[PDB]
Amino acid sequence: KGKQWEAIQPYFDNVVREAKNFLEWSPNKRLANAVTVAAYLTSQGLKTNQVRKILDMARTTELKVKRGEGDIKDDLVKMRYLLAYTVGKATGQSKYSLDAFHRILDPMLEVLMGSPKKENFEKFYDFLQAVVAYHKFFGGG
């Protein structure tokens, strides 16, 4: 239960920052780790309604990667500070749950400003939806 939330998180955090770039591995590794990402976010609450502004921000320019623009500067600006605004507006017991979710995406966003636009952000957006999907399967939404 929560004893799995203490061990598996501290097994995964040194593996998290050591692969800080979003183009780490396009093979079976980034999906195998992503289940373990939602495995220590399972024991926390992790409500999605505060993330709905961030995910729709990821949604509205996902079409704009697809022959809309070749610039994800204005979008990825808006994703960085609002995700800091997530603990920047919502604190409390949901803050200790949302600090551990902060430390995975913030190494990957700073790649995406200087990254390719057709590439390396799809490799982020596929890791985006791998965190959400299993989180519905372990019992959270």
Binding site: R52, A58, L63, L128, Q129
Partner: protein
């Protein structure tokens, strides 16, 4: 027996979603994070749109009911309404009962005349269409899918939103238990360009068949267009761009001789107002 062709009255215009418009279709197609009640959006642009089935169906279902009420006196105006009585076939499982709503789709009852000869005189199915075993009267109107106007394309380019997330809740009368939910609806005030083509097949009965289309539209402006609707989510309003006749001599030659009616700043009730003999007067010269 005897299907002819004389032209196509094309009704060009702009549907103005006065209240939040909601249609709704499938979600989660290779996609995880949504609001789980998305209005149908076409995949190439990712913008919402009003379909043709959602407009032809709601123009139909508001014109079964008008006929179902005045079924008694229109048997002289229109034959083959003497096969019918006001009511549903629901209490006894019959595909042809005495009542009006006769055809079972899956579990619901929708009026469709069973034959070509029966539907030729019926006011509903002569316009919107019909079906049967071996007889099969096909439609006359082509209601096409409506997309956003030249202006509202650019408000998606400039950065303005097009869908809003409204939170509604349910409440117990006793314990005040809040039961919330979210809806994706079109932002109120967006504007879609529709087009309704009327295939003129008989010059005997087009005046009493354009008037029926402007009766089903003039009810739709007082009713809602899809969605939750009874709680505000419809309220749609037709803004007519141009009526155009598109005659038979247009299609062979290519001359711009198509008869254009004047519908600049008129309501849908103002076309059917006394003046329908004056708006479509020059169509009588071509017959």
């Amino acid at each position: 027996m005897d299907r002819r062709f004389y032209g196509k009255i094309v009704i060009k215009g702009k549907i103005k979603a006065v209240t939040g418009l909601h249609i709704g279709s499938q979600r989660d197609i290779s996609e995880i994070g949504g609001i789980a009640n998305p209005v149908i959006k076409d995949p190439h642009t990712g913008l919402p749109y009003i379909p043709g089935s959602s407009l032809k169906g709601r123009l139909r279902s508001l014109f079964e009911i008008l006929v179902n009420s005045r079924l008694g006196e229109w048997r002289e105006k229109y034959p083959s309404l003497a096969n019918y009585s006001p009511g549903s076939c629901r209490p006894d499982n019959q595909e042809n009962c005495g009542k009006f709503f006769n055809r079972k789709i899956n579990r619901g009852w929708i009026h469709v005349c069973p034959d070509y000869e029966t539907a030729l005189a019926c006011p509903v199915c002569r316009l919107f269409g019909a079906s049967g075993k071996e007889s099969n009267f096909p439609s006359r109107i082509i209601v096409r899918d409506a997309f956003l106007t030249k202006e509202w394309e650019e408000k998606w380019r400039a950065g303005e939103a097009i869908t809003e997330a409204k939170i509604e809740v349910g409440i117990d009368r006793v314990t005040s238990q809040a039961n919330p939910r979210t809806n994706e609806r079109v932002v109120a005030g967006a504007e879609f360009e529709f087009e309704i083509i009327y295939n003129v097949e008989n010059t005997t009965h087009w005046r009493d068949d354009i008037k029926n289309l402007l009766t089903a539209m003039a009810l739709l402006e007082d009713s809602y267009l899809g969605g939750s609707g009874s709680r505000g989510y419809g309220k749609v309003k037709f803004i007519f761009d141009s009526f155009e006749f598109r005659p038979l001599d247009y299609y062979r030659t290519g001359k711009d001789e198509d008869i254009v009616s004047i519908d600049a700043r008129e309501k849908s009730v103002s076309d059917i107002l006394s003046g329908f003999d004056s708006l479509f007067s020059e169509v009588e010269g071509k017959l």
